[PDB]
Write an enzyme that holds these catalytic residues in place. Structure first.
Site, PDB file in Angstrom:
ATOM      1  N   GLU A   1       1.811  -0.569  -4.867  1.00  0.00           N
ATOM      2  CA  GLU A   1       0.761   0.367  -5.291  1.00  0.00           C
ATOM      3  C   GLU A   1       1.409   1.706  -5.592  1.00  0.00           C
ATOM      4  O   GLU A   1       1.782   2.418  -4.659  1.00  0.00           O
ATOM      5  CB  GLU A   1      -0.306   0.590  -4.233  1.00  0.00           C
ATOM      6  CG  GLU A   1      -1.261   1.550  -4.819  1.00  0.00           C
ATOM      7  CD  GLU A   1      -2.010   2.402  -3.800  1.00  0.00           C
ATOM      8  OE1 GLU A   1      -1.563   2.487  -2.639  1.00  0.00           O
ATOM      9  OE2 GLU A   1      -3.045   3.007  -4.173  1.00  0.00           O
TER      10      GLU A   1
ATOM     11  N   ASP B   1       0.811  -1.202   0.000  1.00  0.00           N
ATOM     12  CA  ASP B   1       0.000   0.000   0.000  1.00  0.00           C
ATOM     13  C   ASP B   1       0.848   1.257   0.000  1.00  0.00           C
ATOM     14  O   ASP B   1       1.869   1.274   0.695  1.00  0.00           O
ATOM     15  CB  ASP B   1      -0.887   0.002   1.210  1.00  0.00           C
ATOM     16  CG  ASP B   1      -1.740   1.241   1.290  1.00  0.00           C
ATOM     17  OD1 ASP B   1      -2.619   1.391   0.423  1.00  0.00           O
ATOM     18  OD2 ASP B   1      -1.527   2.065   2.204  1.00  0.00           O
TER      19      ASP B   1
ATOM     20  N   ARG C   1      -6.087  -8.875 -11.845  1.00  0.00           N
ATOM     21  CA  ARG C   1      -6.781  -8.845 -10.560  1.00  0.00           C
ATOM     22  C   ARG C   1      -8.237  -8.465 -10.806  1.00  0.00           C
ATOM     23  O   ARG C   1      -8.492  -7.388 -11.370  1.00  0.00           O
ATOM     24  CB  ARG C   1      -6.146  -7.839  -9.615  1.00  0.00           C
ATOM     25  CG  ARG C   1      -6.903  -7.833  -8.350  1.00  0.00           C
ATOM     26  CD  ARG C   1      -6.347  -6.872  -7.383  1.00  0.00           C
ATOM     27  NE  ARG C   1      -6.398  -5.503  -7.882  1.00  0.00           N
ATOM     28  CZ  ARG C   1      -5.700  -4.488  -7.381  1.00  0.00           C
ATOM     29  NH1 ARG C   1      -4.888  -4.673  -6.351  1.00  0.00           N
ATOM     30  NH2 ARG C   1      -5.790  -3.290  -7.936  1.00  0.00           N
TER      31      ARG C   1
HETATM   32  C1  LIG Z   1      -5.502   7.736  -1.075  1.00  0.00           C
HETATM   33  C2  LIG Z   1      -4.407   7.727  -2.138  1.00  0.00           C
HETATM   34  O1  LIG Z   1      -3.758   9.015  -2.128  1.00  0.00           O
HETATM   35  C3  LIG Z   1      -2.695   9.185  -3.072  1.00  0.00           C
HETATM   36  O2  LIG Z   1      -3.217   9.126  -4.394  1.00  0.00           O
HETATM   37  C4  LIG Z   1      -1.601   8.101  -2.872  1.00  0.00           C
HETATM   38  O3  LIG Z   1      -0.640   8.196  -3.907  1.00  0.00           O
HETATM   39  C5  LIG Z   1      -2.211   6.682  -2.872  1.00  0.00           C
HETATM   40  O4  LIG Z   1      -1.210   5.748  -2.515  1.00  0.00           O
HETATM   41  C6  LIG Z   1      -3.372   6.596  -1.859  1.00  0.00           C
HETATM   42  N1  LIG Z   1      -4.028   5.260  -1.962  1.00  0.00           N
HETATM   43  C7  LIG Z   1      -3.523   4.146  -1.087  1.00  0.00           C
HETATM   44  C8  LIG Z   1      -3.137   4.607   0.336  1.00  0.00           C
HETATM   45  C9  LIG Z   1      -4.069   5.042   1.264  1.00  0.00           C
HETATM   46  C10 LIG Z   1      -3.661   5.950   2.424  1.00  0.00           C
HETATM   47  O5  LIG Z   1      -3.837   5.519   3.751  1.00  0.00           O
HETATM   48  C11 LIG Z   1      -5.540   4.537   1.089  1.00  0.00           C
HETATM   49  O6  LIG Z   1      -6.403   5.667   1.194  1.00  0.00           O
HETATM   50  C12 LIG Z   1      -7.564   5.483   1.994  1.00  0.00           C
HETATM   51  O7  LIG Z   1      -7.223   5.617   3.390  1.00  0.00           O
HETATM   52  C13 LIG Z   1      -6.925   6.942   3.872  1.00  0.00           C
HETATM   53  C14 LIG Z   1      -6.591   6.857   5.373  1.00  0.00           C
HETATM   54  O8  LIG Z   1      -7.681   6.337   6.103  1.00  0.00           O
HETATM   55  C15 LIG Z   1      -8.135   7.864   3.615  1.00  0.00           C
HETATM   56  O9  LIG Z   1      -7.868   9.177   4.115  1.00  0.00           O
HETATM   57  C16 LIG Z   1      -8.999   9.748   4.781  1.00  0.00           C
HETATM   58  O10 LIG Z   1      -9.045   9.333   6.161  1.00  0.00           O
HETATM   59  C17 LIG Z   1      -8.000   9.851   7.023  1.00  0.00           C
HETATM   60  C18 LIG Z   1      -8.255   9.377   8.469  1.00  0.00           C
HETATM   61  O11 LIG Z   1      -8.990   8.179   8.502  1.00  0.00           O
HETATM   62  C19 LIG Z   1      -7.996  11.400   6.981  1.00  0.00           C
HETATM   63  O12 LIG Z   1      -6.955  11.900   7.822  1.00  0.00           O
HETATM   64  C20 LIG Z   1      -7.279  13.138   8.493  1.00  0.00           C
HETATM   65  O13 LIG Z   1      -8.260  12.990   9.551  1.00  0.00           O
HETATM   66  C21 LIG Z   1      -7.848  12.169  10.663  1.00  0.00           C
HETATM   67  C22 LIG Z   1      -8.953  12.196  11.749  1.00  0.00           C
HETATM   68  O14 LIG Z   1     -10.229  11.994  11.164  1.00  0.00           O
HETATM   69  C23 LIG Z   1      -6.548  12.733  11.262  1.00  0.00           C
HETATM   70  O15 LIG Z   1      -6.112  11.907  12.323  1.00  0.00           O
HETATM   71  C24 LIG Z   1      -5.464  12.846  10.189  1.00  0.00           C
HETATM   72  O16 LIG Z   1      -4.309  13.425  10.748  1.00  0.00           O
HETATM   73  C25 LIG Z   1      -5.988  13.742   9.068  1.00  0.00           C
HETATM   74  O17 LIG Z   1      -5.020  13.871   8.048  1.00  0.00           O
HETATM   75  C26 LIG Z   1      -7.810  11.864   5.519  1.00  0.00           C
HETATM   76  O18 LIG Z   1      -7.850  13.275   5.464  1.00  0.00           O
HETATM   77  C27 LIG Z   1      -8.975  11.284   4.687  1.00  0.00           C
HETATM   78  O19 LIG Z   1      -8.888  11.662   3.332  1.00  0.00           O
HETATM   79  C28 LIG Z   1      -8.397   7.910   2.094  1.00  0.00           C
HETATM   80  O20 LIG Z   1      -9.513   8.742   1.819  1.00  0.00           O
HETATM   81  C29 LIG Z   1      -8.676   6.492   1.556  1.00  0.00           C
HETATM   82  O21 LIG Z   1      -8.750   6.543   0.141  1.00  0.00           O
HETATM   83  C30 LIG Z   1      -5.849   3.796  -0.263  1.00  0.00           C
HETATM   84  O22 LIG Z   1      -6.874   2.834  -0.065  1.00  0.00           O
HETATM   85  C31 LIG Z   1      -4.623   3.107  -0.914  1.00  0.00           C
HETATM   86  O23 LIG Z   1      -4.987   2.627  -2.182  1.00  0.00           O
HETATM   87  O1  LIG Z   2      -4.348  -0.394  -5.857  1.00  0.00           O
HETATM   88  N1  LIG Z   2      -4.393  -1.554  -6.214  1.00  0.00           N
HETATM   89  O2  LIG Z   2      -3.546  -2.275  -5.714  1.00  0.00           O
END
Ligand SMILES: C[C@H]1O[C@H](O)[C@H](O)[C@@H](O)[C@@H]1N[C@H]1C=C(CO)[C@@H](O[C@H]2O[C@H](CO)[C@@H](O[C@H]3O[C@H](CO)[C@@H](O[C@H]4O[C@H](CO)[C@@H](O)[C@H](O)[C@H]4O)[C@H](O)[C@H]3O)[C@H](O)[C@H]2O)[C@H](O)[C@H]1O
Ligand SMILES: O=N[O-]
Ligand SMILES: *[C@H]1O[C@H](CO)[C@@H](O)[C@H](O)[C@H]1NC(C)=O
Ligand SMILES: [Ca+2]
EC number: 3.2.1.1
Length: 496
Positions: A233, A197, A337
């Site tokens: 990823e 991830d 996938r």
């Molecule tokens: C999301 C993508 O952004 C880029 O494009 C990257 O290049 C790519 O790598 C990434 N995608 C991968 C990584 C994450 C990150 O954790 C996952 O994102 C998934 O999980 C994240 C963490 O829960 C989610 O964040 C969401 O939730 C977080 C908390 O739960 C929030 O933090 C915010 O609120 C929290 C409290 O509520 C705080 O503690 C935190 O400090 C604050 O930043 C984010 O602002 C929000 O957008 C995101 O919406 C979701 O898609 C994805 O499933 C996974 O595919």
């Molecule tokens: O985000 N697919 O691994």
């Protein structure tokens, strides 16, 4: 790290997004093994933050609290029971490894975690691991917010917080060891590989150092010297400093250009059309096939939460989705996938889905079991795309033609195309607004074949369309632009 480690034959993995371990265990035995699936992408198996605002969103699982295999999907024993039962029937398990960060820095401290472990984002304390302030990139990150602000700066992308998620100091041997300790526990349990991830947010070299700490797969189920399958990823599209090729030394990488372009082509956006897919693959600027993990949609972008944006096709666009997944499973490019999701109250306003946070089907927060209907579809709001006839049959199609070359391509200069895989398979598509009736060279042996999209081969006969291949390999195909599924697929194993 480039081989998926699937049993001989099995060529695809399915993402059973948010499924409980007991449900996946049963699915392995009752469907995945007999239907020829190679493995399963499980949601993060480690303890995460229990978020109630919104209520238990799916993304709370990408907010780690510890490495305890304790989540809404099940406890450590249920997980183990799952890997064991699945490996015993030849179906592999791939873990979604969330190792770039812990939870959000603003999440309130306490025991609001899936296993009750205490954690304090503010003081950067995760005692259940344990991690302290010494294990995060606070000092290293150079941005004013402490979060990633500009993707044109590759350093900041790796050292600062992705949307505020506490960023682990992956250069430290202590942190690398904690993560390897977690990954080796899973490997020794029977796990065949991992989805790394947020790999774009980790230095290729830190990933490499962690991978150096990993064991070979469990020798009770895998050949000696088996390295775990690794797919990074990394969302790499157009113009930005970080290229997915920088991670080739660690394993495969997600090819997000794949679903994005297949979606625009199938939707016929900006003048694109299927005839253009003749050079599908590297010819489209994609990574080398042997380094690609491909898919039409993933858990993020099927919600508009990721790369590809609006062009991404999902189960909501069932007709076109089946087509897209069909072309993908028939084409030799990459390792496929298949997505498997749950239906949610998708409701648009001003263009965005305000319910894209909704977690899996649940009762008071408890994820609902996957129920199988008499027609083999799922209830409880699980979509089970992997159970759709046209998809499951193309999964088998991929197995049947494995190793066979892309050949005998045909196109009408628009959206009616077709191609074969050696002499093992042939598939035809009609995405034009008019009927397609023509005789094509299939490269297949003479005989009668069951079209596996409209039906199945059962008891020496077909339940759907039947195609007749002549002594010269030619066959007539007819597809109305009004057909339920505007494409036909036949292979060596659907031959009567
Ligand atoms: C999301 C993508 O952004 C880029 O494009 C990257 O290049 C790519 O790598 C990434 N995608 C991968 C990584 C994450 C990150 O954790 C996952 O994102 C998934 O999980 C994240 C963490 O829960 C989610 O964040 C969401 O939730 C977080 C908390 O739960 C929030 O933090 C915010 O609120 C929290 C409290 O509520 C705080 O503690 C935190 O400090 C604050 O930043 C984010 O602002 C929000 O957008 C995101 O919406 C979701 O898609 C994805 O499933 C996974 O595919
Ligand atoms: O985000 N697919 O691994
Ligand atoms: C297939 O079904 C037909 C009836 O639809 C039957 O006549 C035929 O014998 C069946 N073939 C086999 C091999 O059982
Ligand atoms: Ca990072």
């Amino acid at each position: 790290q480039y081989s998926p480690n699937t049993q001989q034959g099995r060529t695809s993995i399915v993402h059973l997004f948010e499924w409980r371990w007991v449900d996946i265990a049963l699915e392995c035995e009752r469907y995945l093994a007999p239907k020829g699936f190679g493995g399963v992408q499980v949601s993060p198996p480690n303890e995460n933050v229990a978020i109630y605002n919104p209520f238990r969103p799916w993304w709370e699982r990408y907010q780690p609290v510890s490495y305890k295999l304790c989540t809404r999907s099940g406890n450590e024993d249920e997980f183990r029971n799952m890997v064991t039962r699945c490996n015993n029937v030849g179906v592999r398990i791939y873990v979604d490894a969330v190792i770039n960060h812990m939870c959000g820095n603003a999440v309130s401290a306490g025991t609001s975690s899936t296993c009750g472990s205490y954690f304090n984002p503010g003081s950067r304390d995760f005692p259940a691991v344990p991690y302290s302030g010494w294990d995060f990139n606070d000092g290293k990150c150079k941005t004013g917010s402490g979060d990633i602000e500009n993707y044109n700066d590759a350093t900041q992308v790796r050292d600062c917080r992705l949307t505020g998620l506490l960023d682990l100091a992956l250069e430290k041997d202590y942190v690398r060891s904690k993560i390897a300790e977690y990954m080796n526990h899973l490997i020794d349990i029977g796990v065949a590989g991992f989805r790394l991830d947020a790999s774009k947010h980790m230095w290729p070299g830190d990933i490499k150092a962690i991978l150096d700490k990993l064991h070979n797969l469990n020798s009770n189920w895998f050949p000696a010297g088996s390295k775990p399958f690794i797919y990074q990823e990394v969302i790499d599209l157009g113009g930005e400093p970080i290229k997915s090729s920088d991670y080739f030394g660690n394993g495969r990488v997600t090819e997000f250009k794949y679903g994005a372009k297949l979606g625009t082509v199938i939707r016929k956006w900006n003048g694109e059309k299927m005839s253009y897919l003749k050079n599908w693959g590297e010819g489209w600027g994609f990574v080398p096939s042997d380094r690609a993990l491909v898919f039409v949609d993933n858990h993020d972008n099927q919600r508009g939460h990721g790369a590809g944006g609006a062009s991404i096709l999902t189960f909501w666009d069932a007709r076109l989705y089946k087509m897209a997944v069909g072309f993908m499973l028939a084409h030799p490019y990459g390792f496929t996938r298949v997505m498997s999701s749950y239906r949610w109250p998708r409701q648009f306003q001003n263009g965005n889905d305000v319910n894209d946070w909704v977690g899996p089907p649940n009762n008071n927060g408890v994820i609902k079991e996957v129920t199988i209907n008499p027609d083999t579809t799922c209830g409880n709001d699980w979509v089970c795309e992997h159970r759709w006839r046209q998809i499951r049959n193309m999964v088998i199609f991929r197995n049947v033609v494995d190793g066979q070359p892309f050949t005998n391509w045909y196109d009408n200069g628009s959206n009616q195309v077709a191609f074969g895989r050696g002499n093992r398979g042939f598939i035809v598509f009609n995405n034009d607004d008019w009927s397609f009736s023509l005789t094509l060279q299939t490269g297949l042996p003479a005989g009668t074949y069951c079209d596996v999209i409209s039906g199945d081969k059962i008891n020496g006969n077909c339940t759907g369309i039947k195609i007749y291949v002549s002594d010269d390999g030619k066959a007539h195909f007819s597809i109305s632009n009004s057909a339920e599924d505007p494409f036909i697929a036949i292979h060596a194993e659907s031959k009567l």
